[PDB]
Design a protein around this ligand. Structure first.
Ligand SMILES: Nc1ncnc2c1ncn2[C@@H]1O[C@H](COP(=O)(O)OP(=O)(O)OP(=O)(O)O)[C@@H](O)[C@H]1O
Ligand SMILES: Nc1ncnc2c1ncn2[C@@H]1O[C@H](COP(=O)(O)OP(=O)(O)O)[C@@H](O)[C@H]1O
Ligand SMILES: Nc1ncnc2c1ncn2[C@@H]1O[C@H](COP(=O)(O)OP(=O)(O)O)[C@@H](O)[C@H]1O
Ligand SMILES: [Mg+2]
Ligand SMILES: [Mg+2]
Ligand SMILES: [Mg+2]
Lengths: 187, 469, 502, 128, 52, 466
């Protein structure tokens, strides 16, 4: 056997077996930034009431789901190493988990330049003068030549603060600090 | 080739290698710890991950930690300068005397010597005990196993033979402690400093110690059985000497292989043991042999769990041995000491062509009158003693005289009982038992025979009992 | 009130970045946590609500975590934090006279314990160089224990038997009986004690603190308590925490004692906690390393040499067995770790021998025979006179008559058997033991009746403490029973026997 | 369910191209060795109960024919087999020397010689 | 034994009165929360500065 | 706060939510049924999916069927109007006499009392049964167990400790039926209405009732015992009374907890039980306590499977008791009823300072003569009576007069055999055993000590046969 390029996520399960065999095969010949553009076009033709009618049908035939997608994957736009991959999943019986692999390849390819975004969870939204700081003072932490991304979700049970999660960091400043006043009642 | 840790589940760490996969049975060095933790490779899983076993504590093992590789199995020190020392499983000092300065290392994984390197000769060996030397005699170079349950006398019978044989011997000895009480590993370090076998200033010691005890993780209690017979093989093969091998206890080698069987990934066999019982055992019990370059006389204590001899851990050890001395508990409850069962010990050289046709006719009449006793004990429980005939009364009296005469005060019972110790020669042992069967001591009380040496001391007691009457 | 306001100004609201793992499941105590990259094994992790837990398994996808508490405040999607410390409990002499839970928080309500030093629950037993042999005695005040089955200081002794036979009472007369040394003057005859309650309901442990506080026994003990209501990882952690308060004493000079009541309930808290982590079962669904569970515990009970401090740490593990069968799985694994045993039975308890000790089977590696010098004289001959009795005294059906031959010896046993019986929560001393044992073996009781010896004892004992106080002080001081001390006792038993029954 | 030969190195070549470099009709690489049991990717034409012959000189015996790999027991030590070692075929069920050139000799279970006299001189074979 | 029991019944009620009243007092404020956010920025601005 | 059924295996319904996951042990309401179907959350299986255990039957459920979130655990109406009413696991009136109107509601799941809320004071509750008064005295505020097989008498014995204690009680009473048969739960309604304990017409009733029997699904038998345990805590902490509590049978809390533990995905422990056998028992039993605010006097009947006392379900209950009354089968083959084992039954108040030093010596002195009859049964069975001494034909003939003088006719058993139920006081049993130990009745036969009350009936029965 041979050694392979290490993906910077290393997920597990039935996704990350096939979603690393694709990352290692396409990182050879430097086919990396191209192949995500082709995997997002099979990511639209999978959801079709004739294509998805037999991509998850058990009772069609073991063989005719191999010729029907191989004729489909080659003619319209592309003939890269993905045409072998769709032929590889279909030859094994893993056609049901096909949307799982591309959602697994996307999170594996995103970290090659991405951030795994933070999650500010405070209140009803804010103005521009207090948000463009937190979209810039959250860039002062990382410092590795990167372009940050973010999510926002509103929760009122946190009464008077904001929680944020840069990766797996969780600097919590909120109204948990009422429960921390148990030490007054704790002798 | 540096790997990385992925899964620490118990004492079974799995590592993942980027460049070079190491073979089965190697050693791996976990970085960044102030103590030395050694992991030995045991399986190859796929996608360049191996399944190892730690030799120490697995606390503080964070995933993603580097793992080096040495290129060989575990390499201990060996030679002549390992005498009067105590050593670890991976070959380190544990007695705080400094390091072991030797010029030769031996990797602990070797193969059993072939069929054409087998010395065939038998001898005899005299230890001084009237049950060993009469009924299950040893052999110079044989293999000797001490069975019996818990609390019947196995650390005493093995520390008395260290006194008897391993001081009047020209060759060397090794004591390997495979998982026992750390209290009992402090007596024998100090019982032999005052007795000259260990000398702490000059270079005339005659023993080497290997101690990994029962406060140790169960992957390191499976490889002090092999650090023992790697020091005890350099004295047989390389130097052409003669060695003695003392191991206590060898059941903790098997039993510490059942503690990591299912965590490795095997289906467990019958009563809970690993499915490789008689294979990992016989890989080890064939390196303890006498070849045509030297000799080894091995004495191993064998714990029988819950006095159950048909257990699979003792009953697969009855074939790697020449001589069995089986201590029972229903005998040591009668005060008889050594507890050795007369009708269950057995040797190979009990033979009318090695020990002679006078030694043989005696020890096959002691065992024949003790099996004649038990058929009368079922009659006594109903008929009572004063219903028997006058011939069968003569049997019970001699048999109780013989049973009390098999007992003997050891020298290491001078702190337990307060008696004085004996060491009976072989020519007196045969003569004494020959006369009780004849009838030449039918006129004495039984309390003379309890805890004496030669038969001439068992009439010097029947006169003191009659004067103080 | 000034107390609540001063507690709230001393509170520190420090904030920092944690290291944090989202929860993926929570059921029956096990919380498989996504995330938690740099976590150690056996690290203490802290949930959001105030709970606490210990990450046992490491795995590439998830991280198995068990909870010290209750799993109903924890919902999928929670936050698990990192402390940064393998699990440790407070230690010191400042815990003396308290009842504490399995992590060192007081459940008596006398306040916060002021403790300064913290010690792990997973530390290592000392090896071969820093020990020494067993020199000293440990007096229990039981008369069948101190004479026949003595226990040195630093020796693991196993009290084994059934339910409701005396296993807790034996180890509580021992707690009471060291009251006389602890108010004395020398610092090397004391014995500080520790009781670990595993799997016991709170209407037994709050009742044992009552029995230990009228006799003022609680001023020198600690009670580490993990009740049957606790989480199964809290009954597993309790003996490893109680043993680590014992090694404040032993690693600083003094002498400790520790009772595990019991150790058949620290095993079924390991069988359950490590089946829900998906670990494959062994025999009786116990894990692979129940022998390694008990062995790494019972080897810290050392006896250090005198160039380290010379301190000792006795241990008295209790074991409950089913139907009096000693060949089970967890009994035999712990018989072969301890130096000696005390076999408590049921037919002894009911026939009348209470404390129901099988003195035939209660073997003991005698601990370099540190019985004491005077008891060696009277219980040396007692040991043989009782052993002579047991071989010959089991007929219950007599047909022949040999009063010169046999009936003299068996009359010496029933006078020494009925001497060995005792009461409850009233333990004797050693020189009050030498006196009453003197009168039994020297033939001074064969003209009584055996139904009057228990009555003979208390009238004798009250006479010697009252009228003969300077007699018993020469046995305790000089150690031995001297020949002139043999002379003075020869009249006192016979003067009292002249006017006992009148 | 994952399947034994679904590892990240088997799938990785099939995305590249066809497997012309290794033939797999006659030789198959080893997936995973442990405790005297091997797993081999390939060897499509192996009969059941057929001796194979590993790369380090040892032998084998085929016992589990499975839809993605074959499990073969190993004669000898296991510290010589590894992951990535080519296995080949002999083409027959195991056979042993047989004659009257065995009389007076001491043989092991494969018909070899251990008593050190010399090699067996028989001109016949037999399937076990 | 009457002096101590009436202190214990009074102590728990005194705690819950301060505790249950602070829930509405922290909920009503709307101007000081904007003050509370800028210091929460400045704490995080202070927090990343000591790391790197 | 809504979700749909995804999977159904027996009584373990799986349910997927979309936002608002319920915390563990909430209640969920299944919409679209004729009856009430309440699901209680047990697990959290990952990515917005819970696994629940259902209280009633699950037949007729389809996937996608909606499920609504309550917000709270199973709550029941508790108060003084609960007396004389029968309830089920979710607290609905099954007496068909209309609703239960109280001012407050009590959740099923609450914690245990602390360490510093325990009461240590012990007394003696004299019952009127000779085997229990002499050898193993009950207390006033402590747990009691009645271990027994199938067909020995664990409930005829519990119908006496109502007939002797719940009449002369001053406070309230609570009964619970966990997994035992339903005609016996009907003859406790038509025997407490007739005898004035249930008052159908006004508010002068003493006992409450709670019932889940052996027809329910096993998510109901596993939680009916926490229901009667909650109506007997309001009458302790908030009203301050002295309540009784009778539980029969408490084994089915555990037998029906290893029937839903296989389907939650758990590796089994020894002989087939759940992995958590002895933590759920120590969370139910740690709330049945006497405390500083009231006093509950528990009497629990416990079942032993296939007549085995080393089975893991009976043999972990023993650490939670104070008294113990191990019954036996081979005793009851002779005719000794109540078939109590005198050698296996204990207490914590049998003590010379508590039970009185005269009583304590008739106690320990009658076990001594009973053990010595057992220790010769090897020799008597093989050899004979006639190969014994003369002292040991006088611990045999005196310990067969003592076994027979422990059998008493009960009040509830008059309808079986037609013999008057006898109640003895305490002081007439101590006096009546000292006259068998000292040897005053050694001429009377042994058929005269059998099934009589106080000791004067034994000489009267001996007077009859002549
Ligand atoms: N020295 C003694 N003499 C007579 N009776 C005693 C003595 N010590 C204890 N007992 C009695 O024996 C009974 C059981 O004792 P203890 O509670 O210590 O047993 P146990 O086996 O620890 O109980 P458990 O099985 O609940 O742990 C108690 O009722 C106690 O009063
Ligand atoms: N001469 C003797 N013969 C038989 N037993 C003895 C003798 N001297 C002492 N003993 C006792 O027998 C016990 C045997 O235990 P030991 O041999 O030390 O360990 P093991 O459990 O390994 O047999 C010792 O505790 C000791 O007290
Ligand atoms: N005190 C008693 N006197 C006579 N017979 C009894 C007595 N107690 C029980 N029995 C008999 O034993 C049976 C016991 O069954 P019961 O107590 O109803 O339930 P369980 O099977 O739980 O014991 C009764 O039907 C009755 O026939
Ligand atoms: Mg030993
Ligand atoms: Mg106890
Ligand atoms: Mg019933």
């Amino acid at each position: 056997f041979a050694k392979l390029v290490r993906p910077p996520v290393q997920i597990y399960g039935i996704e990350g077996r096939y979603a690393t065999a694709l990352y290692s095969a396409a990182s050879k010949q430097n086919k990396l930034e191209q192949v995500e553009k082709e995997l997002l076009r099979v990511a639209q033709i999978l959801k079709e009431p004739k294509v998805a009618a037999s991509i998850m049908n058990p009772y069609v035939k073991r063989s005719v789901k191999v010729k029907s997608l191989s004729d489909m994957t080659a003619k319209e736009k592309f003939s890269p190493l993905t045409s072998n991959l769709i032929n590889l999943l279909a030859e094994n019986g893993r056609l049901s988990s096909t949307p799982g692999v591309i959602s697994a390849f996307s999170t594996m390819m995103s970290v090659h330049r991405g951030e795994v975004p933070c999650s500010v969870t405070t209140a009803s939204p804010l103005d521009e003068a207090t948000l463009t700081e937190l979209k810039t003072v959250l860039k002062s932490f990382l410092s590795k030549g990167q372009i940050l991304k973010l999510e926002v979700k509103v929760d009122p049970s946190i009464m008077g603060g904001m929680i944020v999660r840069i990766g797996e960091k969780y600097v919590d400043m909120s109204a948990k600090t009422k429960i921390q006043k148990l030490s007054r009642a704790m002798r | 080739a540096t790997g990385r840790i992925v899964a620490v589940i118990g004492a079974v760490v799995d590592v993942q290698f980027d460049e070079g996969l190491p073979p089965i049975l190697n050693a791996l060095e976990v970085q960044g710890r102030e103590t030395r933790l050694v992991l030995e490779v045991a399986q190859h899983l796929g996608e360049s991950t191996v399944r190892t076993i730690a030799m120490d504590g697995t606390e503080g093992l964070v995933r993603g930690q580097k793992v080096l590789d040495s290129g060989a199995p575990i390499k201990i020190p060996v030679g002549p300068e390992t005498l009067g020392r105590i050593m670890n499983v991976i070959g380190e000092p544990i007695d705080e005397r400094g390091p072991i300065k030797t010029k030769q290392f031996a990797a602990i994984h070797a193969e059993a010597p072939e069929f054409m390197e087998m010395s065939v000769e038998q001898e005899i060996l005299v230890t001084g005990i009237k049950v060993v030397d009469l009924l299950a005699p040893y052999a110079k170079g044989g293999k000797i196993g001490l069975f019996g349950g818990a609390g019947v006398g196995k650390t005493v019978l093995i520390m008395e033979l260290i006194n008897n044989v391993a001081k009047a011997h020209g060759g060397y000895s090794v004591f390997a402690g495979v998982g026992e009480r750390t209290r009992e590993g402090n007596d024998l370090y100090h019982e032999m400093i005052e007795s000259g076998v260990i000398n702490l200033k000059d270079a005339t010691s005659k023993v080497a110690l290997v101690y990994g005890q029962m406060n140790e993780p169960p992957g390191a209690r499976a490889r002090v059985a092999l650090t023992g017979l790697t020091v005890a093989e350099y004295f047989r093969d390389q130097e052409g000497q003669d060695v003695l091998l003392f191991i206590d206890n060898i059941f903790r080698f098997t039993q510490a292989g059942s503690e990591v069987s299912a965590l490795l990934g095997r289906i467990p066999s019958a009563v809970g043991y690993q499915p490789t019982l008689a294979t990992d055992m016989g890989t080890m019990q064939e390196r303890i042999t006498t070849t045509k370059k030297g000799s080894i006389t091995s004495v191993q204590a064998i714990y029988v769990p819950a006095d159950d001899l048909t257990d699979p851990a003792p009953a697969t050890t009855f074939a790697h041995l020449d001589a069995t001395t089986v201590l029972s508990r229903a005998i040591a409850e009668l005060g008889i000491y050594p507890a050795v069962d007369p009708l269950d010990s057995t040797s190979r050289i009990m033979d009318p062509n090695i020990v002679g046709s006078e030694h043989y006719d005696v020890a096959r009449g002691v065992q024949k009158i003790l099996q004649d006793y038990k058929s009368l004990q079922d009659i006594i429980a109903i008929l009572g003693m004063d219903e028997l005939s006058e011939e069968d009364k003569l049997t019970v009296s001699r048999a109780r005289k013989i049973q009390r005469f098999l007992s003997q005060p050891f020298q290491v019972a001078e702190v337990f009982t307060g008696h004085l110790g004996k060491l009976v020669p072989l020519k007196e042992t045969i003569k004494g038992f020959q006369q009780i069967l004849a009838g030449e001591y039918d006129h004495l009380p039984e309390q003379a025979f309890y805890m004496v040496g030669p038969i001439e001391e068992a009439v010097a007691k029947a006169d003191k009992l009659a004067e103080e009457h | 009130s000034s107390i609540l306001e001063e507690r709230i100004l001393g509170a520190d609201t420090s904030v920092d970045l944690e290291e944090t793992g989202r929860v993926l499941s929570i059921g029956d105590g096990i919380a498989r946590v996504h995330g938690l990259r740099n976590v150690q094994a056996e690290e203490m992790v802290e949930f959001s609500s105030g709970l606490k837990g210990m990450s046992l398994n490491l795995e590439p996808d998830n991280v198995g975590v068990v909870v010290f508490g209750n799993d109903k405040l924890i919902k999928e999607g929670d936050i698990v934090k990192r402390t940064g410390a393998i699990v440790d409990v407070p230690v010191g002499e400042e815990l003396l006279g308290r009842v504490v839970d399995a992590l060192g928080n007081a459940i008596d309500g006398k306040g916060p314990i002021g403790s300064k030093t913290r010690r792990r629950v997973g530390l290592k037993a000392p090896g071969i160089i820093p020990r020494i042999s067993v020199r000293e005695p440990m007096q229990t005040g039981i008369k069948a224990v101190d004479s026949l089955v003595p226990i040195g200081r630093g020796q693991r002794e196993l009290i084994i038997g059934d339910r409701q036979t005396g296993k807790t009472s034996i180890a509580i007369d021992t707690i009471i009986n060291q009251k006389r040394f602890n108010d004395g003057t020398d610092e090397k005859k004391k014995l500080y004690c520790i009781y670990v309650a595993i799997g016991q309901k709170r209407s037994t442990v709050a009742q044992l603190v009552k029995r230990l506080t009228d006799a003022d026994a609680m001023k020198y003990t600690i009670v580490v308590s993990a009740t049957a209501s606790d989480a199964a990882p809290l009954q597993y952690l309790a003996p490893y925490s109680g043993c680590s308060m014992g090694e404040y004493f032993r690693d600083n000079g003094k002498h400790a004692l520790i009772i595990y009541d019991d150790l058949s309930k620290q095993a079924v808290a390991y069988r359950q906690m490590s089946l829900l982590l998906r670990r494959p079962p062994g025999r009786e669904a116990y894990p692979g390393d129940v022998f390694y569970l008990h062995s790494r515990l019972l080897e810290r009970a050392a006896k250090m040499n005198d160039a380290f401090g010379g301190g000792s740490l006795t241990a008295l593990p209790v074991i409950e067995t089913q139907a009096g069968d000693v060949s089970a799985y967890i009994p035999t694994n712990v018989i072969s770790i301890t130096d000696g045993q005390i076999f408590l039975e049921t037919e002894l308890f009911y026939k009348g021998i209470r404390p129901a000790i099988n003195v035939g089977l209660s073997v003991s590696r005698v601990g370099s025979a540190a019985q004491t010098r005077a008891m060696k004289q009277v219980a040396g001959t007692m040991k043989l006179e009782l052993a002579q009795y047991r071989e010959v005294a089991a007929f219950a059906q007599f047909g022949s008559d040999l009063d010169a031959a046999t009936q003299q010896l068996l009359s010496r046993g029933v006078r020494l058997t009925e001497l060995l019986k005792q009461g409850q929560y009233a333990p004797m001393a050693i020189e009050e033991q030498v006196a009453v044992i003197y009168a039994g073996v020297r033939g001074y009781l064969d003209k009584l009746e055996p139904s009057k010896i228990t009555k003979f004892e208390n009238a004798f004992l009250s006479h010697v403490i009252s009228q003969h106080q300077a007699l018993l002080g020469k046995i305790r001081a000089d150690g031995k029973i001297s020949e002139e001390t043999d002379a003075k006792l020869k009249e006192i038993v016979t003067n009292f026997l002249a006017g006992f029954e009148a | 369910k994952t399947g034994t030969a679904e590892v990240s190195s088997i799938l990785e070549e099939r995305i590249l191209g066809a497997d012309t470099s290794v033939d797999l009709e006659e030789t198959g690489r080893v997936l995973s060795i442990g405790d005297g049991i091997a797993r081999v990717h390939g060897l499509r034409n192996v009969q059941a109960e057929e001796m194979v012959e590993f790369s380090s000189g040892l032998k084998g015996m085929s016992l589990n024919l499975e839809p993605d790999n074959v499990g073969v027991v190993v004669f000898g030590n296991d510290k010589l087999i590894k992951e990535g070692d080519i296995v080949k075929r002999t083409g027959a069920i195991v056979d042993v020397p047989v004659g009257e050139e065995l009389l007076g000799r001491v043989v092991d279970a494969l018909g070899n010689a251990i008593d050190g006299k010399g090699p067996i001189g028989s001109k016949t074979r037999r399937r076990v | 034994s009457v002096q101590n029991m009436m202190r214990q019944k009074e102590q728990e009620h005194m705690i819950r009165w301060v505790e249950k009243h602070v829930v509405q007092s922290i909920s009503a404020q709307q101007e000081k929360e904007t003050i509370a956010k800028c210091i929460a920025d400045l704490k995080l601005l202070a927090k990343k500065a000591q790391a790197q």
